[PDB]
Curated annotation (Swiss-Prot):
Scaffold subunit of various histone acetyltransferase (HAT) complexes, such as the MOZ/MORF and HBO1 complexes, that acts as a regulator of hematopoiesis. Plays a key role in HBO1 complex by directing KAT7/HBO1 specificity towards histone H3 'Lys-14' acetylation (H3K14ac), thereby promoting erythroid differentiation. The chain holds residues 555 to 674 of 1058 of the full protein. It comes from Homo sapiens. Residues 9-113 form the Bromo domain. There is a cross-link at K41 (Glycyl lysine isopeptide (Lys-Gly) (interchain with G-Cter in SUMO2)). This is Bromodomain-containing protein 1. The gene is BRD1.
């Protein structure tokens, strides 16, 4: 149908906007602490601590499959990255500190993304 196509164009454009958002968020992690999944070879107990792991490469896979329906779903995944880190690592670690800084810097990006998603529809 013509409607299904229109819908698919919207999703494609949302995917386009979310790709730019993801790139901006990932620039706020210059140490690449959150670039890849926590290695289960190197942290073998990780899933005993963290039930829903997340990282930027995994979000990018979902993104490119057009697997985010709305900004809320994308933000859920970004919040998992931060929140998982802040639980597994202690306050006095470079990891925790990196997550705080990513959260703080990311807020600005996400604030305008929400306005753009609402605005453009």
């Amino acid at each position: 149908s013509m409607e299904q196509v229109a819908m698919e164009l919207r999703l494609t454009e949302l995917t386009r906007l979310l790709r730019s958002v993801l790139d901006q968020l990932q620039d706020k992690d210059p140490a690449r602490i959150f670039a890849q999944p926590v290695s289960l070879k190197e942290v073998p107990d990780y899933l005993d601590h963290i039930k829903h792991p997340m990282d930027f490469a995994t979000m990018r896979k979902r993104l490119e499959a057009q697997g985010y329906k709305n900004l809320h779903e994308f933000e859920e995944d970004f919040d998992l990255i931060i929140d998982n880190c802040m639980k597994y690592n202690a306050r006095d670690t470079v990891f925790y500190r990196a997550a705080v800084r990513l959260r703080d810097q990311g807020g600005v990006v996400l604030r305008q993304a929400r306005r753009e998603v609402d605005s453009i529809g």
